[PDB]
């Protein structure tokens, strides 16, 4: 019908920009994880020694890592580099969301500030399984056991992301779905400190209809996938709160570690 059509248009526009904005799709990640691909299988990192041997191979967008720190801290500086780049990818993606760039700039800031961690978690799920997580465009694979093995507080950092991911991955969402879900997360009218909620909520209501239509068309066998997904989005805010707490700890207790300025902006006065 006429309204459906506009919502299908939004879904496609969003998928297109998602594909342009983010380097590694869920499609490719799964192909890499299953062993269903023509590419060279990822270098596995499971201890201090394998990290060091694999550091040569772990390029991201043609950026070579720098060639003396303990395992835990080096792992954290890498996840930090990737996060910064993700924030930048998510910001470009947000700008492609119709109506977002017409919002008050201070509110664009606030939506990103609170949205980015939720989205990062969502997109981590695409790269994870029970065994571990793909890194750096899928050239590496870091075992969950290894990450859990790190000295505290770093040992408890990735584990909740894994716990969330095994449950979220059950919904079997694909890239066309995720593209819409991510936009819905960004356009959340209840972020603290927003100035003008109404045009945010109007955009989110279209996005949510687009999401609902998308899930009916793309997963016609899946009963109320839409409702399940919305329940997960609410779990996920609690989980971002725990993570921000853990970084509060890490900033204070681990003085040998420079937290990147972009990330400081985001974590400051958050929960």
């Amino acid at each position: 019908n006429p309204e459906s059509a506009d919502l299908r248009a939004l879904a496609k526009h969003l998928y297109d920009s998602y594909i342009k904005s983010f380097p590694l799709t869920k499609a490719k990640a799964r192909a890499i994880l299953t062993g269903k691909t023509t590419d060279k299988s990822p270098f596995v990192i499971y201890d201090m020694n394998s990290l060091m041997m694999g550091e040569d191979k772990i390029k991201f967008k043609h950026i070579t890592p720098l060639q003396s720190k303990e395992v835990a801290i080096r792992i954290f500086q890498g996840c930090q580099f990737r996060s910064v780049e993700a924030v930048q990818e998510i910001t470009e993606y947000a700008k492609s969301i119709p109506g977002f760039v017409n919002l008050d700039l201070n509110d664009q800031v606030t939506l990103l500030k609170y949205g980015v961690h939720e989205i990062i978690y969502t997109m981590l799920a695409s790269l994870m399984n029970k065994d571990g997580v793909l890194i750096s465009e899928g050239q590496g694979f870091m075992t969950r056991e290894f990450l859990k093995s790190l000295r505290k507080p770093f040992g408890d950092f990735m584990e909740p992301k894994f716990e969330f991911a095994v449950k979220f991955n059950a919904l079997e969402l694909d890239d066309s779905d995720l593209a819409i879900f991510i936009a819905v997360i960004i356009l959340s009218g209840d972020r603290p400190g927003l100035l003008n909620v109404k045009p945010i909520e109007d955009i989110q209501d279209n996005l949510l209809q687009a999401l609902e239509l998308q899930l009916k068309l793309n997963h016609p066998e899946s009963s109320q996938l839409f409702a399940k997904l919305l329940q997960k989005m609410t779990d996920l805010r609690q989980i971002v709160t725990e993570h921000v707490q853990l970084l509060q700890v890490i900033k204070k207790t681990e003085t040998d570690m420079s937290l990147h300025p972009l990330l400081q902006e985001i974590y400051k006065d958050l929960y």
Binding site: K95, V109, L112
Partner: peptide, 10 residues
């Protein structure tokens, strides 16, 4: 939020 601002105006 100077960087975020800068990324948004970029």
């Amino acid at each position: 939020h100077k960087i975020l601002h800068r990324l948004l105006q970029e």
